[PDB]
Design a protein around this ligand. Structure first.
Ligand SMILES: CC(C)(COP(=O)(O)OP(=O)(O)OC[C@H]1O[C@@H](n2cnc3c(N)ncnc32)[C@H](O)[C@@H]1OP(=O)(O)O)[C@@H](O)C(=O)NCCC(=O)NCCS
Ligand SMILES: O=CCCCC[C@@H]1SC[C@@H]2NC(=O)N[C@@H]21
Ligand SMILES: [Mn+2]
Ligand SMILES: [Mn+2]
Lengths: 716, 388, 115
C-alpha cells in the first residue's frame, strides 16, 4: 500500500498537493488507484493511502523483482511516501527467506535506512521559477536576452588521451626536471589565465564552471604545447562557493579530466593560501595537499608584501606535494626612475630573486599586479635576473596601461621563459596582454610564441559570445589608464575606490582621493600594493580625505581619530612586515596601546583540530564529508555552511547554463538543463499566475511532456 | 554478462523492455528524435540521447550507423530492437556485432532467411510444413523461444483472426473453438520448422487454418506487439527471457526456470486491444493533435502497457498511431470479455479521436464470443460500425 | 618593400612635402614597421608620417618600432578615445618610450586631463 505516512517521522501521514504522479504498468503488475493522481489534494481526515500496487509471478523472488522495479518506477512528488520503506522490505534477507514473523519490522533496523532522492526535477524548477520572478542578485530584473547561440567547437576525448605535454612531463621528470625543460626552450612558453585571472579582472570573477567546462575539450588541443593553465586561486574559491553556489573542488576535478595533458596553476597567497583571515600552518598544509591531490600542478606563491619568511610554509607544503613551487616577486616602483625609490631598486629584485632560489623555488615568477613594469624596465629587469639566478623566469602583468604587449615583447628580447596571457576577447585593459595579439606581434622576430593562433582564434570567438552572459559584471574601465604610474592602484582597486568614493559622498573630489592614495603609500613607508595591502592604502586615503587630514595632522590629531580597521590591522603586522618597517610615531597613534605582532601571524595561532571539524560536519550533515570538505569550512566557515544549505535546496546548480542561472526563463521558452550525462530535462515555461492571498505565485511548467506545478513566494 | 542495454525503439515497447531490464538490474539507454523530446520512453531509462538532430522523425530510429555511434558513446554492449523499426533489419544486426554489441535477436542467418517470401517458403518446404496454393481462413500464430544452445519451446498459439486488411486489430490466446489436436498440429509444425534451422531467441511462426488443413505464412524473427497475451496465459516473461537468452543463459537453467515442453500450459484466456488515434468513422485514418484528458483502467485482470498516450504532448503523424496497449485476464473467456468491455468504457481519452467505440462493439458482438470468428469478421459485420 | 620605395620616390618626385603611410587596416606589424620606415628614410628625403589602427592591439608595439627606425610623425588619439579600431593611445606611448632613445613631444598630464 503506497501511502503518505512518513517512515522518517513515525509514519505521521503527510498531507498536501501531489505535483507529479506517474505509474508503473507491465506484465505481472496491477493497480487499484486510491486517492493519488495528477494534482490531488490529500486530506488529513482520511486513511491516507494513495495506491495499492501488487505483483504476481510464478515464483516468489520474481514477484519481488517486479515489486522492487515497480516501486522504483512509481513516482509521487509533492507529498511524502512510504515507497522507500517498501523497497527496503523487498530487498531484505529475512523477507525473501519467507520465514519472517510479525516481529520482522521491529527486529530489522536496516529497513529504516532511507536515503533522500535529491529530486533533481523539482529542484531545477523550484530554482528557475525563483530567479524568474524574484531575480538574481546584482543583476537587473529585465526579461532574458543572449541571442548569439555560438556553438562550442569540441575535440574527441580519445584524441586528447593521446596528447602529451607538461602534465605528462611532470610525471616523468618531476618539478626540478620540468624546470630544466623550460630552460632549454627557445620559444616563449605561455600560461593562459582565461579560466582564472582574466575574468577576475574583467567580470568580477563571475565565470561559472559550465562555461569553462563547455570548452575544456577545445582548450586542451589549443594549449597542447602551453606551459600551464591558470584556473584556480585568487578570488575563485570564495566566489564560486558564495556568489556562484558551486563547489570549486568540482570545477578543479572536472577540468582535470577534460585536460589531462596540461599543468594546472593557481595563485596561492603566502599568508592564507586562498582564505580571508589568518590561519595556523597546518591549514596551509592541508589546503595545498588537497589541491595537488586533486589536479593543481604549479603553485604560484606570493606575499602581499614580498616578505620571504611568510612564504616558507606554503613552500614546504608544495615541495612535499611533489608539485611545482613558484616564488613570486611583486613589482612596484620603477627601476628606470632612480628618483622613484632607493629601496625598490634593480638590486632589491636581484637579491630577492637570489634569496628565493635559495629557498628552492622551482620557477621564479614576477607578478606586476598593477601593470607598472614598463617595457624598458622589463628588458633590464628580466635581463638582470637570468644571469643573476638560474630558475626559469615567469613574468605576469596587466594590460592596464595599454603597454602589456610592449612589456612582454621586451621581456622576450631579454630571454624570459614564461608569460601569462588570455584569449583576445578576454584580455587587454585590466586583464593580461592578448595571446592572439602577441602571436603576430613577434612576427619576424628571433623568438616566437609556442602556441596555435587558429585554435586560439576559435577560443576568442567563443569567449566573446560567452562574455555576453556576464554583461552585468562588466567593470567600469573602458580604456587604458596611465595614471597608474603615479598612484599605483592594482587592476581593480581604482574601480572599487571610485564606487566607494562616490558612496562616501566624495564623487567630485576623486582627484584628491587619488592624490592621497600615492601619499598614504609613502606615509606607510612605500609598501608593495597587492591585496589585501592595497585596500589598506585604499582605506587610509579614503579616510584621510574624508576627515580632511594632512601628512602631519594624521600624527598630530591621531589620539582622537580611531582609524579604519584595515589600517590598524596592517600596523599590528597582521599582514606581515613591510620591506622598510613601520614608522614608530605612526604606529603608536594608530594602535593606541594595542599589541603589535613580531613574527608572521601563523606561529601565533594554534593548529586546527581537523577531527573535531570532521566530528562537527558529520553530525551537521547526514554523514558524507571529505578531506576537501574539512579545509573548506575552516577557510570559509559562513560561506561553506551557506553553500551546503543551497546544495540542499537546489542540488548541483553549476549544471545549469549561465543565462538560465542569472535570468530563469521567459514565457513559452523551452530550455534544456543537463543534470547528468544521459539525463537532460526539457522544460517549458507556459505561464505564471498573479500572486494569491499569500504572495505565492503559480508557475505552470511542462517538463519532459509532463505538466508541473510550482509555488514561488514573491518577495516583491 | 550484459552491462548496458540500449533500446533502438520508442513508446510502449521501449518502456516494456526497460521495465524488463531494470528487473534484471541492467543499466538502460533510450534514444529519441526532436518529436519525442516530450515522449514517455525517454526518462524510463537511466540514460537517453538525441540520435542526431539533423535527422527528422523517421530515420532517427532507422539510421543504422548513427544509432551505433550512440550505442558506442554510451558503452552499450547489448541492443534490443523491439519491432517495426530496425527489428528485422539484418544489416543492422550485422554491423551491430562488428562493433562489440550483442543484438538481442536471432542469429544473422535467420533474419536473412525469414525476410523475403521466396526464402521464407524455401526453408519452410525443407521443414515439412504445408504452403499455400482461399476465403474464411484463421490467423493463428505460435510463439516460440530458443536459447543460443539449441533448446526451443513454444508458448502456444495466438489467434489474430480479427484483422481488417493489415492491422492485427484484436488478439486472443489461447484460441477458443480450436480442438487441442487440430491445434497440436499447428504448434508441432511451428516447432518443427524452428528445430530444423536451429532457431535462437524469440520469434513467431504464422499460420492460416481451414478446419483441419493449415498453411505457413511467415516468420517474425523478433518479439510481437501481441506478446502480452501469451505472457499472461503462461506466466512467462517473454521480454525478460529475450535479454537473458542473448546473454547466453540456458532455458531450463536457474535464471529463466523454463518448464520443459509438457510442463508448459495455458491457464485461462487473455485478450489485448491496441487503443489508437484511428477514426473508426473515417477509414481508420489516425488523428494528430493534443491530448487534454487521459484516464485509465486497472483492477483485477487488467494489464496496461503505456505508450504515447497521456495527459500532455500531442501525437505526431510520423510514428504508428498506437497509444495504449490494454490487456485482460481470467479463467473463463466470458470473464475476460467482460473485463475488456468495462475496461474500455472506463478508458478515457479526450482531445483526439479513438478506436474505442469500435473496439467496444467488437467485444459485445457475440459472434466474437463464440470463438468461431474468422479473418473476415470485420468484413462480414456492418453493425460493427456504430454511430454511438 | 620594393613597391613602397618606388612609390615613395615617385610621390617625392610629384613634389609632395610629406610622405604618409596609411595603415587603414592596421596590417603594418611591429617588425614590418621597422623595416619599411627604415628603408623609406634612406630612400627618400621626405619626412615620414605614419598612421595606423590599433585593431590588432599591437599599434603601440608598431609605433615604438617606427620610432626606432627614424619616423618623424605618428598619428595618435587620447587614451579614452583610443585603441581597437582607433589610433594607438598617446597616453600609453608616452610612458612606453620611457627608457628609450626617442621621447614623445607632448604634455603628459594635459593628456590625462584631456582623456
Ligand atoms: C535515479 C532515479 C532512478 C531516481 O532518482 P530521484 O532522485 O528520485 O530522481 P533524480 O533526481 O535522480 O532524477 C531527476 C529527474 O530526472 C528525470 N529523469 C530521470 N531519468 C531521465 C532520463 N533518462 N532522461 C531525462 N530525464 C530523466 C525524472 O523526471 C526525475 O524527476 P521526477 O521524479 O519528478 O520525474 C531517476 O533519475 C530516474 O527517474 N531514473 C529513470 C527511471 C527509473 O530508474 N525507474 C525505475 C525502473 S524503470
Ligand atoms: O533573489 C534571490 C532568489 C534566489 C536566487 C539564488 C541565487 S543562487 C546563486 C546566487 N547566490 C545567492 O546567494 N543567491 C543567488
Ligand atoms: Mn594578476
Ligand atoms: Mn584611418
Amino acid at each position: 500500500r503506497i501511502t503518505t505516512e512518513d517512515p522518517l517521522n513515525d509514519f505521521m501521514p503527510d498531507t498536501g498537493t501531489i505535483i507529479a504522479y506517474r505509474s508503473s504498468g507491465g506484465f505481472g503488475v496491477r493497480l487499484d488507484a486510491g486517492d493519488g493522481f495528477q494534482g490531488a489534494e490529500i486530506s488529513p481526515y482520511y486513511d491516507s493511502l494513495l495506491v495499492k500496487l501488487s505483483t504476481h509471478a510464478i515464483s516468489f523472488k520474481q514477484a519481488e523483482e517486479k515489486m522492487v522495479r515497480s516501486l522504483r518506477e512509481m513516482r509521487i512528488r509533492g507529498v511524502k511516501t512510504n515507497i522507500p520503506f517498501l523497497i527496503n522490505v523487498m530487498k531484505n534477507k529475512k523477507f525473501t527467506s519467507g520465514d519472517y514473523t510479525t516481529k520482522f519490522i521491529e527486529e530489522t533496523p536496516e529497513l529504516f535506512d532511507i536515503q533522500p532522492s535529491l529530486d533533481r526535477g523539482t529542484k531545477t524548477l523550484e530554482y528557475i521559477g525563483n530567479v524568474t520572478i524574484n531575480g538574481f542578485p546584482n543583476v537587473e530584473k529585465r526579461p532574458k536576452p543572449d541571442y548569439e547561440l555560438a556553438s562550442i567547437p569540441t575535440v574527441s576525448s580519445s584524441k586528447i588521451a593521446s596528447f602529451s605535454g607538461t602534465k605528462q612531463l611532470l610525471d616523468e621528470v618531476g618539478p626540478k626536471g620540468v624546470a630544466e625543460w623550460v630552460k632549454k626552450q627557445d620559444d616563449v612558453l605561455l600560461t593562459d589565465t582565461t579560466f582564472r585571472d582574466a575574468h577576475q579582472s574583467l567580470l568580477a570573477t563571475r565565470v561559472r564552471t559550465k562555461d569553462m567546462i563547455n570548452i575544456a575539450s577545445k582548450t586542451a588541443d589549443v594549449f597542447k604545447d602551453g606551459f600551464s593553465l591558470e584556473m584556480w586561486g585568487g578570488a575563485t574559491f570564495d566566489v564560486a562557493y558564495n556568489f556562484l553556489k558551486e563547489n570549486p573542488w568540482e570545477r578543479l576535478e572536472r577540468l582535470r579530466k577534460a585536460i589531462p595533458n596540461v599543468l594546472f596553476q593557481m595563485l596561492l597567497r603566502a599568508s592564507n593560501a586562498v582564505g580571508y583571515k589568518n590561519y595556523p600552518d597546518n591549514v596551509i598544509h592541508k589546503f595545498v595537499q588537497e589541491s595537488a591531490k586533486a589536479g593543481i600542478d604549479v603553485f604560484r606563491i606570493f606575499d602581499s608584501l614580498n616578505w620571504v619568511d611568510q612564504m616558507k610554509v606554503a613552500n614546504e607544503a608544495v615541495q612535499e606535494a611533489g608539485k611545482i613551487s613558484e616564488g613570486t616577486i611583486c613589482y612596484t616602483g620603477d627601476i628606470l626612475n632612480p628618483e622613484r625609490s632607493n629601496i625598490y631598486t634593480l638590486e632589491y629584485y636581484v637579491k630577492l630573486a637570489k634569496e628565493l632560489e635559495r629557498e628552492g623555488f622551482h620557477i621564479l615568477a614576477i607578478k606586476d599586479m598593477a601593470g607598472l613594469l614598463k617595457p624598458k624596465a622589463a628588458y633590464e629587469l628580466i635581463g638582470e635576473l637570468k644571469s643573476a639566478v638560474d630558475l626559469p623566469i615567469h613574468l605576469h602583468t596587466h594590460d592596464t596601461s595599454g603597454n602589456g604587449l610592449l612589456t612582454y615583447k621586451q621581456a622576450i628580447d631579454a630571454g624570459v621563459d614564461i608569460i601569462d596571457t588570455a584569449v583576445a576577447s578576454m584580455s587587454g585593459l585590466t586583464s593580461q596582454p592578448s595571446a592572439n595579439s602577441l602571436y603576430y606581434a613577434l612576427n619576424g622576430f628571433p623568438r616566437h610564441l609556442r602556441t596555435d593562433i587558429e585554435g586560439m582564434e576559435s577560443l576568442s570567438h567563443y569567449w566573446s559570445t560567452v562574455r555576453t552572459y556576464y554583461s552585468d559584471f562588466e567593470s567600469d574601465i573602458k580604456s587604458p589608464n596611465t595614471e597608474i604610474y603615479q598612484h599605483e592602484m592594482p587592476g581593480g582597486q581604482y574601480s572599487n575606490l571610485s564606487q566607494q568614493a562616490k558612496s562616501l559622498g566624495l564623487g567630485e573630489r576623486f582627484d584628491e582621493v587619488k592624490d592621497m592614495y600615492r601619499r598614504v603609500n609613502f606615509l606607510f613607508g612605500d609598501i608593495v600594493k597587492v591585496t589585501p595591502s592595497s585596500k589598506v592604502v585604499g582605506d587610509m586615503a579614503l579616510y584621510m580625505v574624508q576627515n580632511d587630514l594632512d601628512e602631519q595632522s594624521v600624527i598630530t590629531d591621531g589620539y582622537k581619530l580611531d582609524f579604519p580597521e584595515s589600517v590598524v590591522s596592517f600596523f599590528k603586522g597582521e599582514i606581515g612586515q613591510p620591506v622598510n618597517g613601520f614608522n614608530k610615531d605612526l604606529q603608536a597613534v594608530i594602535l593606541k596601546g594595542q599589541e603589535a605582532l613580531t613574527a608572521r601571524p601563523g606561529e601565533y595561532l594554534e593548529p586546527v583540530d581537523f577531527e573535531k571539524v570532521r566530528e562537527l560536519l558529520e553530525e551537521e550533515q547526514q554523514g558524507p564529508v571529505t578531506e576537501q570538505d574539512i579545509i573548506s569550512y575552516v577557510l570559509y566557515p559562513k560561506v561553506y555552511e551557506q553553500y551546503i544549505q543551497t546544495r540542499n535546496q537546489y542540488g548541483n546548480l553549476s549544471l545549469l547554463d549561465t543565462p538560465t542561472f542569472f535570468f530563469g526563463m521567459r514565457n513559452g521558452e523551452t530550455v534544456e538543463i543537463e543534470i547528468d550525462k544521459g539525463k537532460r530535462l526539457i522544460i517549458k515555461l507556459e505561464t505564471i499566475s498573479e500572486p494569491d492571498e499569500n504572495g505565492n505565485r503559480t508557475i505552470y511548467y511542462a517538463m519532459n511532456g509532463q505538466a508541473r506545478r510550482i509555488y514561488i513566494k514573491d518577495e516583491n | 554478462q550484459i552491462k548496458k542495454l540500449l533500446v533502438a525503439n520508442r513508446g510502449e515497447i521501449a518502456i516494456r523492455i526497460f521495465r524488463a531490464a531494470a528487473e534484471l538490474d541492467i543499466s538502460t539507454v533510450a534514444i529519441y528524435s526532436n518529436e519525442d523530446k516530450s515522449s514517455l520512453h525517454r526518462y524510463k531509462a537511466d540514460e537517453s540521447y538525441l540520435v542526431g538532430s539533423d535527422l527528422g522523425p523517421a530515420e532517427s530510429y532507422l539510421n543504422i550507423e548513427r544509432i551505433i555511434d550512440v550505442a558506442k558513446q554510451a558503452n552499450v554492449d547489448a541492443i534490443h530492437p523491439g519491432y517495426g523499426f530496425l527489428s528485422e533489419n539484418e544489416q543492422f544486426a550485422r554491423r551491430c556485432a562488428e562493433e562489440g554489441i550483442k543484438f538481442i535477436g536471432p542469429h544473422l542467418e535467420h533474419l536473412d532467411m525469414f525476410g523475403d517470401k521466396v526464402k521464407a517458403r524455401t526453408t519452410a518446404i525443407k521443414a515439412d510444413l504445408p504452403v499455400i496454393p482461399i476465403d474464411n481462413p484463421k490467423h493463428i500464430e505460435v510463439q516460440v523461444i530458443g536459447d543460443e544452445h539449441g533448446n526451443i519451446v513454444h508458448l502456444f498459439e495466438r489467434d489474430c483472426s480479427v484483422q481488417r486488411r493489415h492491422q492485427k486489430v484484436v488478439e486472443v490466446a489461447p484460441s477458443v473453438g480450436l480442438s487441442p489436436t487440430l491445434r497440436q498440429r499447428i504448434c508441432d509444425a511451428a516447432i518443427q520448422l524452428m528445430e530444423n534451422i536451429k532457431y535462437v531467441n524469440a520469434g513467431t511462426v504464422e499460420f492460416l487454418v481451414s478446419g483441419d488443413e493449415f498453411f505457413f505464412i511467415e516468420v517474425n524473427p523478433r518479439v510481437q506487439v501481441e506478446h502480452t497475451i501469451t505472457e499472461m496465459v503462461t506466466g512467462i516473461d517473454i521480454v525478460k527471457t529475450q535479454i537473458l537468452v542473448a546473454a547466453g543463459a540456458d532455458l531450463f537453467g536457474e535464471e529463466i526456470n523454463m518448464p520443459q515442453q509438457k510442463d508448459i500450459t495455458t491457464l485461462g484466456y487473455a485478450i489485448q486491444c491496441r487503443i489508437t488515434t484511428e477514426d473508426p468513422l473515417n477509414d481508420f485514418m489516425p488523428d494528430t493533435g493534443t491530448i487534454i484528458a487521459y484516464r485509465s483502467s486497472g483492477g483485477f485482470g487488467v494489464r496496461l502497457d503505456a505508450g504515447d498516450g497521456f495527459q500532455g504532448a500531442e501525437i505526431s503523424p510520423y510514428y504508428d498511431s498506437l497509444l495504449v496497449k490494454l490487456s485482460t485476464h481470467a479463467i473463463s473467456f466470458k470473464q475476460a470479455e467482460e473485463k475488456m468491455v468495462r475496461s474500455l468504457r472506463e478508458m478515457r481519452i479526450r482531445g483526439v479521436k479513438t478506436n474505442i467505440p469500435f473496439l467496444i462493439n467488437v467485444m459485445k458482438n457475440k459472434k466474437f464470443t463464440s470463438g468461431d470468428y474468422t479473418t473476415k469478421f470485420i468484413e462480414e459485420t456492418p453493425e460493427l460500425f456504430d454511430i454511438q
